[PDB]
Amino acid sequence: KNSLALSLTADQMVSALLDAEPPILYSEYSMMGLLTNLADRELVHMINWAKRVPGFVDLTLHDQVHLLECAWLEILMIGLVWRSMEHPGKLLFAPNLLLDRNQGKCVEGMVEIFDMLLATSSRFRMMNLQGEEFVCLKSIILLNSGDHIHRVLDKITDTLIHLMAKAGLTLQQQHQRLAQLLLILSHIRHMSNKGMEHLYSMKCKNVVPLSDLLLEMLDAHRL
């Protein structure tokens, strides 16, 4: 149908995805309280980011709501992992909230997820994942979380390959790298799934107040 994503060349797609990037936020100036408030504010930016992903607003509103409902924790996580790459062994929740692995210990179930997030960060850094590849992956997470949607995913795949080719990677290296990145998405799905379980548990235990948006987002998966 009417679709900007299917009208863009690979360079325009990259440009548009780069332009759509949300900002990096600061932590407010208990650990669970800080992290929650930070995720809440990121979610608002994430919703407006998605509206700028070529193809997303061409979907029906019901589709759009469903993709954000399914993908939101995946997208927060890959964002966190991206900005932590320059800080091996640490999670850069924000420029004023840099947490070592071991600061994940205070909260029940969190440090196991921290280890998985750090493994992901180390993998991306070892692969020398580029900004342009990252924004492609993030849009694939959004669209794959839930026929036109598949045409767009094909297009973002083409765009990923293109970036690798322009970077001088051989065909073999492109196929291998494409696979390496997409297999990491399986792991990001895993972490999101486990986190969603812990979030619901935290709501029940009533020890930190999840925000309205977070509560509403959380209610999506237990449905």
């Binding site: 608002v44 919703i47 407006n48 509206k51 509103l61 759009q64 709501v65 954000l68 409902e69 309205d212 948006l213 509403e216 987002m217």
Partner: peptide, 8 residues
């Protein structure tokens, strides 16, 4: 809905 509204 907070999402549905925000998307508009």
């Amino acid at each position: 809905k907070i999402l549905h509204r925000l998307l508009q």
